[PDB]
Amino acid sequence: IIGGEFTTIENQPWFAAIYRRHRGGSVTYVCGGSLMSPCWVISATHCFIDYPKKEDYIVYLGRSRLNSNTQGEMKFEVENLILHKDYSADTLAHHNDIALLKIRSKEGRCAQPSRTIQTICLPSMYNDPQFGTSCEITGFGKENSTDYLYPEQLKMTVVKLISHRECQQPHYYGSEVTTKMLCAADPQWKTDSCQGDSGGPLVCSLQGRMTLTGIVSWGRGCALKDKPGVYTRVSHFLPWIRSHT
Numbered sequence: 001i002i003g004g005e006f007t008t009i010e011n012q013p014w015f016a017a018i019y020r021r022h023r024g025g026s027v028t029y030v031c032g033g034s035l036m037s038p039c040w041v042i043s044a045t046h047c048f049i050d051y052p053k054k055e056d057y058i059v060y061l062g063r064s065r066l067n068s069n070t071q072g073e074m075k076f077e078v079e080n081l082i083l084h085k086d087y088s089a090d091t092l093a094h095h096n097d098i099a100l101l102k103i104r105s106k107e108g109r110c111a112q113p114s115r116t117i118q119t120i121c122l123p124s125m126y127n128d129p130q131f132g133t134s135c136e137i138t139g140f141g142k143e144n145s146t147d148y149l150y151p152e153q154l155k156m157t158v159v160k161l162i163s164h165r166e167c168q169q170p171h172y173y174g175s176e177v178t179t180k181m182l183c184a185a186d187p188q189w190k191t192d193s194c195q196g197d198s199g200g201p202l203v204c205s206l207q208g209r210m211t212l213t214g215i216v217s218w219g220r221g222c223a224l225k226d227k228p229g230v231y232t233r234v235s236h237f238l239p240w241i242r243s244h245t
């Protein structure tokens with residue numbers, strides 16, 4: 001997250017931090033995700049497509065720092081890794097960028113809801129918030145494009161939704177962004193999500209309840225003029241999420 005504010009997990013209880021075990025023992029941070037139900041976490045397919053082995057992934061819930069064991073955290077492995085069978089990647093855009101991870105602890109159980117570990121609700125059919133709505137994003141991603149390390153403490157920020165037609169303008173993303181994706185950004189282009197934040201939650205308060213409206217997917221640079229962050233529009237995939245869970 002470029003700009004924004006440092007935060008802690010109690011402020012984002014459904015945020016999942018996903019790592020990957022490398023041959024040798026070293027572990028590096030991969031992407032974020034969100035808790036859908038006690039046994040399921042949803043993220044982005046592009047975060048796993050090149051290393052599809054479910055055994056190498058480690059998932060944490062209730063974790064506040066990149067290299068610290070936050071009191072109350074729970075560690076899990078991936079029982080089933082489901083990727084969208086129609087996923088593809090072009091020069092900038094990613095298609096059907098959505099994935100499902102069934103989690104299980106070493107004892108064989110799913111997550112246990114607590115003050116720092118909670119699920120987020122899915123959106124409903126044909127009911128997404130209007131352009132201009134402020135929503136929040138969270139992640140352990142880069143604070144600047146030139147940084148090679150990720151911040152040690154979790155961060156979050158607020159950006160606003162941009163209409164499909166505004167996002168299809170020539171200086172934005174033209175026909176590269178489709179009706180199955182959502183754009184969001186800062187009018188002053190000072191804050192935004194960035195590499196490292198992929199797969200994380202775009203949460204919008206809609207008609208009262210906080211909803212998982214989007215999944216951090218792609219974007220040209222980070223916090224650049226006329227180049228909004230692009231997100232997978234969860235409402236379109238409800239039928240897919242239902243059949244695969």
Ligand SMILES: N=C(N)c1ccc2cc([C@@H]3C[C@H]3c3ccccc3)ccc2c1
Pocket residue numbers: 046192193194195196197198216217218219220221222223227228229230
């Ligand atoms: N403007 C933003 N809000 C934004 C959001 C997500 C982003 C994800 C990547 C990570 C690297 C992309 C990638 C491409 C292919 C496969 C792996 C990773 C790069 C830039 C990004 C910018």
